[PDB]
Amino acid sequence: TTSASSHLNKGIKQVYMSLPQGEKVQAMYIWIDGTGEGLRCKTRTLDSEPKCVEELPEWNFDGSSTLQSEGSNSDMYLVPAAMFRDPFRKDPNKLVLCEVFKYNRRPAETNLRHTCKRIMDMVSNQHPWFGMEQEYTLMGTDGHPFGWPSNGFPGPQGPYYCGVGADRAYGRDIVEAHYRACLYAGVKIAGTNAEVMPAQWEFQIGPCEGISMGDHLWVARFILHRVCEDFGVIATFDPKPIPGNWNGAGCHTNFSTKAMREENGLKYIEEAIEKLSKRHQYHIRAYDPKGGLDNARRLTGFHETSNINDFSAGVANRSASIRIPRTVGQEKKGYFEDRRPSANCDPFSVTEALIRTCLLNETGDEPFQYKN
Amino acid sequence: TTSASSHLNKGIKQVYMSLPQGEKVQAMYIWIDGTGEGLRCKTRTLDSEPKCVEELPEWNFDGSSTLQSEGSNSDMYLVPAAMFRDPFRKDPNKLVLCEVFKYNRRPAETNLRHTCKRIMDMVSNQHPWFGMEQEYTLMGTDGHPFGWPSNGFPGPQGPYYCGVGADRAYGRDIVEAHYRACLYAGVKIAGTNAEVMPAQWEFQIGPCEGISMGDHLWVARFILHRVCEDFGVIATFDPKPIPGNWNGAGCHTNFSTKAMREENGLKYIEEAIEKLSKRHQYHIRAYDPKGGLDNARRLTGFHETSNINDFSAGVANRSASIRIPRTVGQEKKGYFEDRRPSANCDPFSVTEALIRTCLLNETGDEPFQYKN
Amino acid sequence: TTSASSHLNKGIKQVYMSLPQGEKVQAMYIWIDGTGEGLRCKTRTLDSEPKCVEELPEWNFDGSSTLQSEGSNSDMYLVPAAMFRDPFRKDPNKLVLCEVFKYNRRPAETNLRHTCKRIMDMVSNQHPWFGMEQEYTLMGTDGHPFGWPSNGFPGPQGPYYCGVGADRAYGRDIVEAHYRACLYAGVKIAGTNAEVMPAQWEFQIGPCEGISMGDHLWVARFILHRVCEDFGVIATFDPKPIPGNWNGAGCHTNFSTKAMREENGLKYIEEAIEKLSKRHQYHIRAYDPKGGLDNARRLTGFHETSNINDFSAGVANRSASIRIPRTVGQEKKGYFEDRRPSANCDPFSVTEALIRTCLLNETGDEPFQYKN
Amino acid sequence: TTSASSHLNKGIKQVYMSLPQGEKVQAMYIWIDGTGEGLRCKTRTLDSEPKCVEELPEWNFDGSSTLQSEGSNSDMYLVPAAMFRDPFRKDPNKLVLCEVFKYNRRPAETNLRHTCKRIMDMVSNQHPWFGMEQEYTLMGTDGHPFGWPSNGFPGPQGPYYCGVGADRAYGRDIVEAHYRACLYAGVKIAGTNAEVMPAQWEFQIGPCEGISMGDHLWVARFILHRVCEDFGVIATFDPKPIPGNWNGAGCHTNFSTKAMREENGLKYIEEAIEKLSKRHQYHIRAYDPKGGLDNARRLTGFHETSNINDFSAGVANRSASIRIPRTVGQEKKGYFEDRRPSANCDPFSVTEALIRTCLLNETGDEPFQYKN
Amino acid sequence: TTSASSHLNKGIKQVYMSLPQGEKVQAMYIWIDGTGEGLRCKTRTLDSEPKCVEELPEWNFDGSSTLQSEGSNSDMYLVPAAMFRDPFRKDPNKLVLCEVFKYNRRPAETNLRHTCKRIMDMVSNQHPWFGMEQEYTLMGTDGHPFGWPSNGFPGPQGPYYCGVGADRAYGRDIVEAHYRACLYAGVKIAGTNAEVMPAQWEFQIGPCEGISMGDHLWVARFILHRVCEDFGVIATFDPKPIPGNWNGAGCHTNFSTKAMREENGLKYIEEAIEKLSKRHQYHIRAYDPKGGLDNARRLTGFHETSNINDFSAGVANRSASIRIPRTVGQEKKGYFEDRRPSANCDPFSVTEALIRTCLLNETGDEPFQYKN
Numbered sequence A, B, C, D, E: 001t002t003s004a005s006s007h008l009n010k011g012i013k014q015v016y017m018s019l020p021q022g023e024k025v026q027a028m029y030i031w032i033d034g035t036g037e038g039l040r041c042k043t044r045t046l047d048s049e050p051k052c053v054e055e056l057p058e059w060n061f062d063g064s065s066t067l068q069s070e071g072s073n074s075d076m077y078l079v080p081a082a083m084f085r086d087p088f089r090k091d092p093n094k095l096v097l098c099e100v101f102k103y104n105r106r107p108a109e110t111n112l113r114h115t116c117k118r119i120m121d122m123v124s125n126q127h128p129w130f131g132m133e134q135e136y137t138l139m140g141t142d143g144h145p146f147g148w149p150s151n152g153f154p155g156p157q158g159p160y161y162c163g164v165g166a167d168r169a170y171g172r173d174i175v176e177a178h179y180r181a182c183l184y185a186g187v188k189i190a191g192t193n194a195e196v197m198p199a200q201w202e203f204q205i206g207p208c209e210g211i212s213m214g215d216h217l218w219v220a221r222f223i224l225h226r227v228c229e230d231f232g233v234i235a236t237f238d239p240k241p242i243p244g245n246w247n248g249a250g251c252h253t254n255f256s257t258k259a260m261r262e263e264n265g266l267k268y269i270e271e272a273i274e275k276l277s278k279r280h281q282y283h284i285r286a287y288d289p290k291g292g293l294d295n296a297r298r299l300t301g302f303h304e305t306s307n308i309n310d311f312s313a314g315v316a317n318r319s320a321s322i323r324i325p326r327t328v329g330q331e332k333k334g335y336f337e338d339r340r341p342s343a344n345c346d347p348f349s350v351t352e353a354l355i356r357t358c359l360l361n362e363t364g365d366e367p368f369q370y371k372n
């Protein structure tokens, strides 16, 4: 059910961690791996506490161990990009998110922040905002959802959405610890709730400005993985973890600009939606690390989902693939929600695709190569 | 016996919860389900601590999954009504109880605090007071009462009422934690005691004036469910959890007015009882969430219970439909107790029916006209 | 072996008990039930901290559940008698001992404090002092002594009296916790030691004047029951728990008066012993809740016990019915010990009979009825 | 879970049963108790092997222990009615089914065979034939269906009907043993199959003539109970053991006479159905051991059942109350089926009601007192 | 629950017991110890198979180990009295029941067959017949009844008497094995049934003539003990093993003579009843191994038992001290039943007392010496 490491005595760990540290500081480097969905990390000591992200050194790792290079020139580079406070070691320790490069100082295949930042630099004038809702399922060490009957199923759906009670919610300790850890670290977490099927949860981040959204999301999921490791369970972002009559997991994203946020933005929202209506296949390709075969499992037209190759829009409709909140419609200003993306999406890719389609008016099936 | 969640290590949870929070504040929203006897909740972050229930925003939820709407017009509203301190995440965090309205901004089917408040407003002058006694049973995850022998029974009744000892009281930790948490939160809890069958307990709320009774009781129920979830057991309000020669569970209500309290209260008490004597079927219908089917299994005439179809009153008689305390009878002032309502009743409905029948001098088998 | 409640996580309980209370305070009422040996309790909240036992209101309970009345007029009365401060909830909470009356406002059958206090205050001038040694057996939830081999026995007696090893003493945690709890509450506890048979212990209380003996002993018994409930074991006062070649349980009593305790008090000690020599059957009947059937199984002339119906006395003779300490004999001052009472005796009855026979002068098979 | 008795070593019992018997013989008596749905048994020793049911003597039992009489005149009589070979002890030992009589020689309250025999005798010319389909569910000692996940459910329905494999058929050994034992005993068992709900099964008895149908069915039930006791599981005939979206249990009955079995009997079948369509309420009341409240939980129009308050007929319609097999319809002769009776019905009552309504042309609400 | 020796592999033993024996024969001796209710046994080898009990030789044992002598003159004699076939080792091995004498060749204290034989020889001409019903309870090694919930109780009484099913009959395999072993051995066993309390059973021995009754009953007790040892459980004959609202155990006895058996024996039956009605205390003293202390705990007036201090008679009344079967009453010949003796009685004493009081017209509280 749970891993062997979770059966050790944690009082010993607390006793050891209670010791005073001294004068030197710990820093943890984190980066994306070659599969486009994993994460890796390492630790090193520093002589004094940094005050900003740009006053700490670069590093390197062995690329042949993460299938990002060959043995002859396995060396790769790590360049810091953003830093936060460390909730597992407390102040003055830090967490560092880095960018990958090849031995010739060129971005790696799975490095998309490089282009996303350049794209954001152009529209900084109107400075949009993003907010995403991440869903996940807690799994045991034997390949079954945590807390489910051994080789069986719980009752039918209907009582588990936003439920309270020992027979209606599984694993709230993880959620509470994750919430507090994100708040302490400095990730702007906005809320949480339980999902339709048991052992399924959700948390939301934002609104975030420009490039910071992807960094915030990535650090949040790193923290989730670390906490789950502490408790001895597994967190998975698979879009369809359990086949059959059980809901899937998505990553709905909310978007707005200054024009929409101002008075009478509904017309701008409408024009943006009409622009989006003509790039369905391009966006579907963008929203998946494997081109869309993963999202093919989830999007089937039922269980509060729309069809893979059908575009629609509406107000208060949760199966339209794009919806306007009723309050937003009534007030004639706000944002709109896109609910095609999958749970294992890449925030940089999704955000860049949306920005390109909406603000730069470009069309086709291949992104415009370069802009000044 | 106990849930899998209860077998995780709680020291980790404690160390995570001991971190400083910062400047943000957490708030939990609670509302009543579409079946009339369930609860749901979810959380959000706020920029600063509120100091009144009128200075925090509204929200919404998906009604399709709570059995109160359909997909096309699923969205529903939430309007805060009362506020308390959060005992699970201490200050400055809060918890909020709210009402439910549908898309056209009309009260939902299961919302009755609206009318209850509207009528308490017009009855205000008499300053009515209420007090209620809630009973419940503790159950394991396998469907048997907590602590009972596996596929068996404990000894016969008689030594379990207000008992002390490892062989006479089951699950006192839950009770102690629940009472302390209620006091911290600010609910008007008045006491507790053990009941006739083992693993059965009770707590009392009040006295409180007017509309506050319902929200106090509902918040106490939510706190109990949360504490039981933390410990890994289930709390049920079923009127007849175990068939046979075992006691049921009820919700005795106490009623009073300023005239009955100041002096010569028996004169008003007797006439109120007389007026209540001729609305038996109406009150029985009001006291149940499903028209009275559930209560039929409890009220049978024995086990210190009155019959369903018979009305009675007396002094110090615990087998009647209405009881008058001996001290009240002696001192000529006080209150009287109604023993018909079942353990899974709705306080809003109960108090509304009581006020209508007693103080408004109404009659008939139908709810009265819109106003009074 | 141990109860199911003992297998819950107590860190959660401590965390919930680690919250501030506020302005309101809790009081726990305790009284003796209709069997003459059981205890019951209830809790209620007060607006402010009481300063003396005279500030507490009276209360009531349902006598049909406790086997002391009928459902028609089950209601009884509770009137506080003594007050201590609660060691399970810390300051400013309290626990209060009460005596029971019938609905006529007269004492109940098992209420003996009423006459005991009246007799005590009639000889108060003499300043009588009492001390009692209470012993008990720790039992598992399956009906066997705690820590004993499953269905087996430990070695023969001889090494367990005041043993100091893991193979010589069973359950010292309970003993230490009980000692500290009594000291914090304010009971007049004087010492403890392990007994001849494994898993058997004893504690001493006194000396205290007049009517305080019964109150102190009863409150100590309640505290022991609560602590054992916390740890998940059972404490029993049965005079002969294990049949065969194993020691029994008794409650020796020490008695003193101002006349004695002075220079050459041995004269009065011997005079009182001779006076007591005449009422053996009366004292034997008094010393047992059920007239002496229980004490028959213990008093058999073996294991340092005297015969049931044979009176004897001597200095430093532990096999006699009455014993005088050797130091008392050497100094010619002090007290004498009565070894007849059984472990489940009633202090009020025992002390009243002792004073009747020693300070007052009474004879015959019945007590003097006209208040003396 | 399974019973404690099932964990003993059965090789010892086999070794003991291998002993040669001798010249004495054993006989087991079986009868119905006061609840109307229970069986009891006991054993006697005989001097020689009987050749027919006429050679066995009468006996008696204490009726105060089966709630069938009072303690003053508790004696009741047993009169043998049918005989079979014993499959648990093998030849020459016997099984005997008996009728119950009162101390004054009047039939007991739950003795319907007495009237059924006369009713069947008065219509011996037609040579009626009957056939019943008994459905049942296997349960563990913990109260859940055998083989189901602990506190959980198996997959949705559809693959279990007439299933084969370790994951779609639970407990086939019991079915095999029961079939073989019935064949050895001499009961007319026609077939068996697995049912829609996992752990649910069915077996068919018939065709039998006249009064023998009830005897065969009762003996079959007894043998099933004994086999399940040997294996350590429980067999329940409750119409609706699991609430929700799961199948119930019925006791469909097949009926025909010589005229119907002859050529062009479809006319007789149709007129019988016609005259049967008038006494729906009477037949519903007769088809229940308690009166019909039990069958109300199964007949609701769902999962291949007709509504309790409506009467309907058809050829291939399995949702109607009466059905006519397609083969019968094509060939113009045969039998017809009744699908109303519940799983825990009494065959004597069912057959008596069918005969009275169809062949004796009775009408009204109360049975004709004498003769028909 | 079950003993360690019952967890061994029994196939090995079964393999070993299949070896051909040879020309030697084993014989096991059985005798009653000094407590008056315990059995002992041992085995020896014989050269040839004996044909009658007179061919077996004498033997001896060490009485110091059975508390029947002292260490100096410890030797005691054994004299064969009856012979049976061995069911545990099969033919041609034997069982032998013996009498006990001390070193000077006269009966020991607990040897009553010596006197019973002479008393029976005195009245041989009347051909008395006896029959007894033995009740017993099965227990685990932990001290609780076999199959009972761990530290709990099953449902209330009512369904267990003569029950069938996994949930209402505990340990039928032992009953079956004991029945078959007795039949093979040659004991006159007449039947068996399940009793009111779960795990309680009964078997009937008779009708035996004269002195053979005690021999048959003792051998049956021994066989039951050996079978239970094989299965790993304990059989206890205590009259009241479980205090409370649970049935006790008795050893009812049935008696007749040739005159009673012949026509119009009712006069002799009632004559004997009236003759017995005036020696209640003497018979109560004789019907116990310790003067009647044990039986006092069973006879209390309820649970179909008569009061210890009263004598009664009637027809078909199971609450009286004596009873005449309704069949006997309807006819004018038969037998009568005495329900006073306890489960742990001695058949020799019971039969001797009945004969002396009913056929020798003895009087007083002492037995007449020598012949009558």
Ligand SMILES: Nc1ncnc2c1ncn2[C@@H]1O[C@H](COP(=O)(O)OP(=O)(O)O)[C@@H](O)[C@H]1O
Pocket (backbone or CB within 6 Å): A129, A130, A131, A132, A133, A190, A204, A205, A206, A207, A252, A254, A255, A256, A261, A334, A335, A337
């Ligand atoms: N003006 C805005 N621009 C972008 N995102 C916004 C804006 N206002 C709110 N959001 C985001 O919308 C999200 C709301 O998600 P959620 O409450 O789960 O909506 P729903 O449950 O109705 O899909 C929040 O994460 C928030 O950050």
Ligand SMILES: Nc1ncnc2c1ncn2[C@@H]1O[C@H](COP(=O)(O)OP(=O)(O)O)[C@@H](O)[C@H]1O
Pocket (backbone or CB within 6 Å): B129, B130, B131, B132, B133, B190, B204, B205, B206, B207, B254, B255, B256, B261, B334, B335
């Ligand atoms: N004047 C009053 N008006 C209304 N309710 C009152 C008044 N005084 C006391 N009560 C209520 O009466 C209740 C007493 O309940 P409880 O003591 O459990 O009743 P019982 O003694 O029948 O068990 C308390 O919850 C309290 O709030």
Ligand SMILES: Nc1ncnc2c1ncn2[C@@H]1O[C@H](COP(=O)(O)OP(=O)(O)O)[C@@H](O)[C@H]1O
Pocket (backbone or CB within 6 Å): C129, C130, C131, C132, C133, C190, C191, C204, C205, C206, C207, C254, C255, C256, C261, C334, C335, C337
């Ligand atoms: N003057 C006195 N009057 C009454 N009791 C006394 C007096 N002096 C001591 N005692 C009591 O005698 C009790 C028994 O002492 P204890 O240590 O048990 O000695 P022992 O075990 O040898 O009997 C103590 O609890 C003490 O309070």
Ligand SMILES: Nc1ncnc2c1ncn2[C@@H]1O[C@H](COP(=O)(O)OP(=O)(O)O)[C@@H](O)[C@H]1O
Pocket (backbone or CB within 6 Å): D129, D130, D131, D132, D133, D190, D204, D205, D206, D207, D254, D255, D256, D261, D334, D335, D337
């Ligand atoms: N001529 C007949 N008269 C009465 N009953 C019959 C006749 N022929 C067959 N039956 C009965 O019909 C039943 C058919 O059982 P089954 O095939 O399970 O029914 P279904 O086809 O509805 O599942 C058998 O139990 C059999 O005894």
Ligand SMILES: Nc1ncnc2c1ncn2[C@@H]1O[C@H](COP(=O)(O)OP(=O)(O)O)[C@@H](O)[C@H]1O
Pocket (backbone or CB within 6 Å): E129, E130, E131, E132, E133, E190, E204, E205, E206, E207, E208, E252, E254, E255, E256, E261, E334, E335
């Ligand atoms: N003629 C008789 N003389 C003596 N004993 C008899 C006679 N007939 C039957 N019995 C005895 O009756 C006993 C059976 O009684 P039982 O069936 O237990 O009756 P119940 O259970 O109603 O008390 C047998 O042990 C048998 O020895």
Ligand SMILES: [Mg+2]
Pocket (backbone or CB within 6 Å): A133, A202, A204
């Ligand atoms: Mg959301």
Ligand SMILES: [Mg+2]
Pocket (backbone or CB within 6 Å): A133, A252, A337
């Ligand atoms: Mg959304």
Ligand SMILES: [Mg+2]
Pocket (backbone or CB within 6 Å): B133
């Ligand atoms: Mg109350």
Ligand SMILES: [Mg+2]
Pocket (backbone or CB within 6 Å): B133, B252, B337
């Ligand atoms: Mg009350």
Ligand SMILES: [Mg+2]
Pocket (backbone or CB within 6 Å): C133
């Ligand atoms: Mg001492």
Ligand SMILES: [Mg+2]
Pocket (backbone or CB within 6 Å): C133, C252, C337
């Ligand atoms: Mg002492």
Ligand SMILES: [Mg+2]
Pocket (backbone or CB within 6 Å): D133, D202
């Ligand atoms: Mg069928």
Ligand SMILES: [Mg+2]
Pocket (backbone or CB within 6 Å): D133, D252, D337
């Ligand atoms: Mg059919």
Ligand SMILES: [Mg+2]
Pocket (backbone or CB within 6 Å): E133
């Ligand atoms: Mg019998």
Ligand SMILES: [Mg+2]
Pocket (backbone or CB within 6 Å): E133, E252, E337
């Ligand atoms: Mg009998």
